[PDB]
Structures are given as C-alpha cells and as structure tokens.
Amino acid sequence: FVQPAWQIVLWAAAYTVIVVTSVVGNVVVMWIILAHKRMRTVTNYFLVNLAFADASMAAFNTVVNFTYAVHNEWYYGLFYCKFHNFFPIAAVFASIWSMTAVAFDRYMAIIHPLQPRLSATATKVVICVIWVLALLLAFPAGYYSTTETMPSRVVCMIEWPEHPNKIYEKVYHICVTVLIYFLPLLVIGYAYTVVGIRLWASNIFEMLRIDEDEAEKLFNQDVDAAVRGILRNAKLKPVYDSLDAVRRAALINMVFQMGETGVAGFTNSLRMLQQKRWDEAAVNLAKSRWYNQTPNRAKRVITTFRTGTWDAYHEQVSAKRKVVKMMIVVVCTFAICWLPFHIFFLLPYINPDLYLKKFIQQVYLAIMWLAMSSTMYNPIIYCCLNDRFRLGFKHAFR
Numbered sequence: 597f598v599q600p601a602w603q604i605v606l607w608a609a610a611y612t613v614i615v616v617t618s619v620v621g622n623v624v625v626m627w628i629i630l631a632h633k634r635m636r637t638v639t640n641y642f643l644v645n646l647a648f649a650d651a652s653m654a655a656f657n658t659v660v661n662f663t664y665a666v667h668n669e670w671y672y673g674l675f676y677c678k679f680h681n682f683f684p685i686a687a688v689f690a691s692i693w694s695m696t697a698v699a700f701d702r703y704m705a706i707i708h709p710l711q712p713r714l715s716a717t718a719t720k721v722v723i724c725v726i727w728v729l730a731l732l733l734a735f736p737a738g739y740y741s742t743t744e745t746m747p748s749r750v751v752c753m754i755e756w757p758e759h760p761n762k763i764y765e766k767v768y769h770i771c772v773t774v775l776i777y778f779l780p781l782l783v784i785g786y787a788y789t790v791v792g793i794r795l796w797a798s799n800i801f802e803m804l805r806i807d808e809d810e811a812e813k814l815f816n817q818d819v820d821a822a823v824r825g826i827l828r829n830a831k832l833k834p835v836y837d838s839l840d841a842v843r844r845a846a847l848i849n850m851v852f853q854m855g856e857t858g859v860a861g862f863t864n865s866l867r868m869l870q871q872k873r874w875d876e877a878a879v880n881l882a883k884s885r886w887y888n889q890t891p892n893r894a895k896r897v898i899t900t901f902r903t904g905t906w907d908a909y910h911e912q913v914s915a916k917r918k919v920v921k922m923m924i925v926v927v928c929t930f931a932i933c934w935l936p937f938h939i940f941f942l943l944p945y946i947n948p949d950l951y952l953k954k955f956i957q958q959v960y961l962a963i964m965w966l967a968m969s970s971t972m973y974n975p976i977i978y979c980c981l982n983d984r985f986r987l988g989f990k991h992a993f994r
C-alpha cells in the first residue's frame with residue numbers, strides 16, 4: 597500500500613544510472629577490442645559478445661520494465677509486450693554462455709596446450725550458435741505474451757494454452773532457470789577451480805623435480821620415507837608438526853639435499869620457524885655454508901619458509917593469472933545479481949499466498965534493480981583489475 601512520490605522519483609534516478617553506465621561502459625569495451633584489433637584475442641572476441649548483450653538488454657528493457665512496475669499499466673502495445681518478455685531471456689543466455697566460452701578457452705590453454713581448440717573462424721560460429729540457441733529458448737515466452745484491454749487500463753500478461761494442470765509453463769520456466777543460471781555456473785565453477793589450482797598451487801614432487809642420457813628420479817618412495825624419518829628424529833619432529841603444508845615441503849627439500857643429521861644442525865633457524873618468526877629465520881639461513889655453496893636453491897627454500905607459498909616455483913610476471921582473477925570476479929558478480937531474481941519467481945511454487953501479500957512492489961523493485969545492474973559492473977571490473985583496459989578507457993577521454 598506504500599505509494600509515495602518522493603520514492604518514485606528516487607527509484608527512476610537509481611534505474612537511469614543503470615542505463616547510462618551500461619551503454620557508455622560496454623560500448624567503450626566493445627570499441628577497445630574490435631578496433632585497434634591488435635588486441636583481438638579469442639577471450640576478448642567473446643567478451644565483445646557479452647558487452648553487446650549487456651548494453652542491449654539495458655537499452656530495451658530497463659525503461660519498459662520500470663514503468664510497468666511503478667504504474668501497473670502497459671503503454672507500449674502488443675508488439676513491445678511480446679518483445680519485452682522475449683529479449684531478456686535471449687540476452688541473459690548469450691551473456692552467461694559467452695562467459696562459459698571464455699572459461700572453456702582458458703581451461704584448454706592452461707590444462708591442454710598440445711591440443712589447440714582456438715580458431716578465428718570458429719569463434720564467430722560459436723557466437724553464432726550461442727545466439728541461435730538464445731532466441732529459440734526465449735521464443736515461447738514471447739509467443740504467449742498478450743495485452744488484455746480493460747475499462748481503466750491496458751495490461752501485458754503471458755497466457756499459455758489451457759492444460760489440465762498447465763505443467764508446460766512451469767517446466768519451461770524451470771528449464772530456462774537451469775540453462776540461464778544453475779547449469780553454466782556449475783560448468784564455469786569447475787573450469788576455473790581446476791585452472792585456479794594449476795596456476796597458483798604446487799606440491800613436493802613438483803618442487804623436488806625442479807630443485808633435483810640419464811635415468812628417472814624415484815621421489816614417490818623417498819618422500820614417504822623422509823616423512824617417516826623426520827617424525828622419528830627428536831630435534832626435527834616438533835618443528836615439522838608446527839609447520840603448514842607449504843613450509844613442511846621446504847623442510848623436506850633440505851633433508852633431500854643435506855640429510856636428516858645435517859638439517860638437525862640448524863638448531864636456531866629451526867627454533868625460529870617453530871616460534872613462527874619467518875623473516876628472522878629467512879635472514880639466518882642466508883648466512884649458512886648451505887647458502888654460500890648453492891645460493892639459487894637455498895634462495896627458493898628460504899623464500900618458501902618466509903612466504904608460505906609456491907611463488908618461488910611459478911613465473912613472476914604472469915599474464916595468465918591476471919585474466920583468470922578478472923573472469924572469476926565477473927562470474928561471482930553475475931551469480932550474486934541473479935540469485936534474488938530467480939528465488940523471487942521460484943517462490944509461487946512453494947507458497948502462492950506469500951507473494952500476493954504486504955508491499956511486494958517495493959521488494960520487486962529492489963530485486964529487479966540488482967538483476968539489471970549486472971549489465972553495468974563488467975567495464976568497471978576490467979578497469980579496476982586489467983592494465984590495458986584501464987589505459988584504453990583513459991585514451992577515451994576528451
């Protein structure tokens with residue numbers, strides 16, 4: 597029953613913010629990639645499709661969807677009634693599956709580099725298929741939309757054929773919710789977790805392979821035998837228990853080079869690590885005869901004890917790591933923005949009366965604002981994280 601003018605003008609301002617920031621931002625992003633085109637990569641060519649879909653939904657739907665919510669009267673006739681219910685499903689499908697396409701491309705490059713699935717001509721075919729499938733799934737929702745003429749007003753509502761329980765409308769609604777949200781988010785989730793583990797994480801067998809024609813190494817057995825020996829030694833066991841997985845590997849790396857008895861000698865450095873004085877321990881171990889003879893290896897073991905990370909056994913300036921951080925943020929934004937929207941339309945199946953009660957109009961306006969804002973965050977994410985994109989937007993200033 598809450599209907600104040602002070603609120604309506606305030607909402608329209610918050611809503612127009614979406615339209616302006618989504619058209620400007622995404623067109624600049626489209627521009628940056630498409631021309632120069634000295635930056636036209638498989639990942640970026642997909643991002644262009646996502647930039648189009650975003651700027652597109654914002655132009656067409658934000659205006660029409662806000663007016664109807666506020667006024668409860670359809671002003672744009674049967675054609676735009678059908679179109680405003682068709683295009684959002686097509687635009688959301690094309691966006692989420694373009695995101696998946698970038699995830700597949702990174703996975704195939706990080707995980708399977710010998711098999712190349714990157715092709716210029718094919719990218720256009722993928723973007724082509726994405727849109728064919730998108731407009732097909734959106735079609736039934738557009739088909740059944742119609743305007744009912746009444747004495748006081750014109751109403752835009754979607755009415756499916758009269759079935760004994762009208763199961764088709766519900767099934768379709770559920771399927772759309774899967775293809776547009778749950779299914780691709782699961783797929784994107786899987787790729788970036790495997791790729792996340794490969795780019796950031798490592799292990800003792802990888803470490804020992806680096807630090808240590810000719811036969812192959814036999815670490816598999818020796819690593820478990822090194823662990824058994826450390827837990828037998830009274831000078832080494834307490835230190836080892838206090839250490840995390842990454843630091844435990846640094847201690848075993850040394851036992852592999854000097855041996856249990858040799859490593860047991862660094863009494864002070866070992867009491868420092870136990871006490872968790874990483875920087876202090878790192879300074880002391882650098883003064884050893886171990887460091888003087890093998891500085892490169894010793895520098896790697898020391899920096900592992902100090903940082904508690906695999907940073908020493910991975911390239912310093914990594915461009916592959918920057919893009920994955922960007923894309924993960926973009927996906928998590930989508931997931932956050934669309935969840936209340938999907939829950940909102942999913943509830944009439946649990947409690948039908950709960951929806952047609954209280955002042956849900958103020959809620960639907962808050963829920964619909966978040967969903968539509970997903971359309972503007974992407975250019976901001978590209979500038980906040982990536983070096984070239986922020987220089988590109990900087991170049992678009994007069």
Ligand SMILES: C[C@@H](O[C@H]1OCCN(Cc2nc(=O)[nH][nH]2)[C@H]1c1ccc(F)cc1)c1cc(C(F)(F)F)cc(C(F)(F)F)c1
Binds near residue numbers: 737769776
């Ligand atoms: C067109 C509209 O659809 C909803 O409003 C009408 C009823 N409709 C249930 C229905 N009954 C049918 O028979 N067909 N659809 C709703 C619905 C349909 C599919 C869903 F997954 C969730 C809700 C819609 C869809 C999305 C999308 F695509 F993101 F979901 C985004 C937006 C916007 F952002 F512009 F507000 C608007």
